[model samples]
Target: SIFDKRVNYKPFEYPEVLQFTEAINKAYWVHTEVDFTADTQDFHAHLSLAEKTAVKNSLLAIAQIEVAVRSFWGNIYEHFPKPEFNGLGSTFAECEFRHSEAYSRLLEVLGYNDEFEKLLDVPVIRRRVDYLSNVLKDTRSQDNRKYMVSLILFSILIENVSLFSQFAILLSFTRFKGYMKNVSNIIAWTSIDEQIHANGGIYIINKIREEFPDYFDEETLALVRETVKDSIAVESDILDWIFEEGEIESIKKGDLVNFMKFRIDESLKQINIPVIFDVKVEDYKALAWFEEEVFANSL
Candidate 1:
């Protein structure tokens, strides 16, 4: 019966794969352009005190996020649908390994390597790892296809946010000539690779969803929403730590919600997928409305 239904299926070809690989390579080159050999003085020539603190905080946050990313990659490969998509899983494994390496190198270059051990011990980062691990564990108890869908959704949200936020940060840093340049450059490089990583996940999910629509339903959509909610809650707490007291004071109420809404809206414009789930771009806008309502008077 499933096969009898007419679906908008597209054939995968070698040329498409080659194009994807080319894109990935370009991202890799961008990543390698940052020179880590520069002295601290060379890097920190013109940073204001506040900007310096912000850069350090951003790096620390990245170190924390890398732990979660590593765990997610390992878990996905361990539990992914085998045989048919083993190569895809392997690609994620390589991406994760490289991302962790890059983040570690960044810490070392910035003189935070000595503090890495202590930073990993932080509760905020550790909690995110525990949370995602639990989600993966629960997914494993069910079916691989469902789990893959969940992973895809999570990847979509994360990659979109990263691309949007990091791109804006890059533009801002380009305006100032200082130590922040190196940090911003590092993020810009990472952002390029992340886009490829995101595209890979998108390809996989779109394939699965088209081929096996029955597997994705209301329950799976609910799970995706729940995960997004939990992630946002955790991120809100982390942002508090990253921003200084004055910096936090500077953030107007609904600033994050507005920025996130705009990013999601803009990114969705480029995504070719139809609104299979009940939540579409408009739904995302509606969700942000609640945030505006809650924070309306605070700022």
Candidate 2:
């Protein structure tokens, strides 16, 4: 019976994890916070044809991925092996739903009804959903070291690589154009929620590695690196037109890619895996989810 392992994620008296538990359960906003009236007016009145398209594309990006995230994170929620951790990860499901609602409401503001469902069939839209779903399903269907690899791909691809760039596009429209406070504010709220989800994945990975040291030997670590590489390779498609066609301003290609690479390293380090990317990558680390200044900044 010595080999029978306890499935619970936390120690018997883990006061340290209490803060994280509290963080995940904390009250956050929903679609109600997004009064889309002003954004609706701004969309019709001020935006150029290109800028309008960018906004729609950004909303579509948000709408599509949140659906998949809801499913993927639910898989993690069910597999927590302990209800204690399940409760924390499950709150993230609520956040993802709110994000989906917010995106749906944005589409409503654009006069989309049943046609909104058709957006999923679009060439680019289906690609992201189908691709990530497969990658995550491959990881989630198994009960081995693949779990950590999935977490890395989720944080890097879903949270950072995809949503951040789309948010950057929305940031362009709302902040620089000074047109749509409602849409901008909603994105800020959703972004904050996403940061929590991202960090939660990382924290759980670190906890798993610490609790079960045997699962994270050299072979598993290499798998984490390779999986992220594959995910990032797929994630590159988003950037294909995210900037060039989005007519985005005020940043360079190198800056964004390096920020992504920085996140890859950060995620790797969180799970006790070494930063496999070479040194001399950019120094742009991700923001803390619970930080103070983001409350008012134009995200």
Candidate 3:
């Protein structure tokens, strides 16, 4: 119903979605604002060999995902033909672009620019991108139900659930090791933007349900659950790769796995879905303080 409706800006059918623009306006930041002097020093002088590998891989993984999100998030505007939705979609895409730029800036400042392209070819990174592209690729005029499913999975699963682990991985260095504090700040800002995107996605889906409830059915819900579960499997491989050399004292492989599952449950709960993952807040103690610090800073 939202697809065929007249595109109007006033009396917004989904004010919740439009509110994202207001929040984004206040959260504006540029990649250049962050000075990486301390981060460069931390990378070269402070971190262990294993920790260095983990940091580089984690940043690369985040960069690839951010770039992919920037590319595909605008696809929503092709189908959701409303001025407000168009505005939100373009703004959201730009946020993803800035995130990708921030990570690239960090890598270059850390002197990993030469390794960027080759590192992206690492098998796990390639596999993760391929898996995500299947869902996030353009879905403009497809089956209405399938399109909605893609939007749900892209918003709830990828934008909401997938990136948190990477953010937590970098934040652990700041929380436990007192390294890469500047990169952590940028990551924190990105997380704040993601929280808004996830919320906006949930609002859009719920609003569409109000107008065209038939777009959602058990089959669609099943797809949502299935894709989220599959993405977690993909994420586990990347986590292993990041920690392949060794795990950080504060962030272990198993804990990030549990953290992803736990965050998935939280996102599922927002959309009124049954929580399928058996995870608890107590599951990821290594990441507990980082999440808490992010919340306090954002507030």
User: Cα lDDT of all candidates, in order?
Assistant: 0.51, 0.63, 0.78
lDDT of 2 by residue, 1-299 (tens): 11123465556333334555566456466778557787788888987776766677667667767643466666564555454555565666666787787787777778665555787666566667677775576555456566666766677667755677666556555445677777777777777777777777776666666667787787867765776676555555655544435544534445555556666776666666678654352345322221232365323
Clashing residue pairs, backbone N/CA/C < 3 A, model 1:
none
What lDDT does model 3 reach?
A: 0.78
Q: For model 1, how does the per-residue alpha-carbon lDDT over 1-299 read when each residue is reduced to its tens digit?
A: 11122233333221244444566554453335566555356447754555455556566766665534454544443553333233444555566567677677777777887666777586765665666554545444445655665565556655655233323332243333433445455555555556666676666565566667766676776665566556556555555555553362223214544455454444333333322223445444533432232222111
Question: How well does model 1 score by local distance difference test?
Answer: 0.51
Candidate 3 displacement at residue 178 in angstroms:
1.6
- Compare the candidates by TM-score and give the number of the best one: 3
Cα shift from native, residue 157, model 1 (Å): 4.5
Q: Could you tell me the TM-score of candidate 1?
A: 0.68
Leading candidate by lDDT: 3
Against the hidden reference, what TM-scores do the models get?
Answer: 0.68, 0.79, 0.92
Shift of residue 248 alpha carbon in model 3, Å: 1.8
| Ranking 1 against 2 by TM-score, winner | 2
Higher-scoring candidate on lDDT, 1 or 2:
2
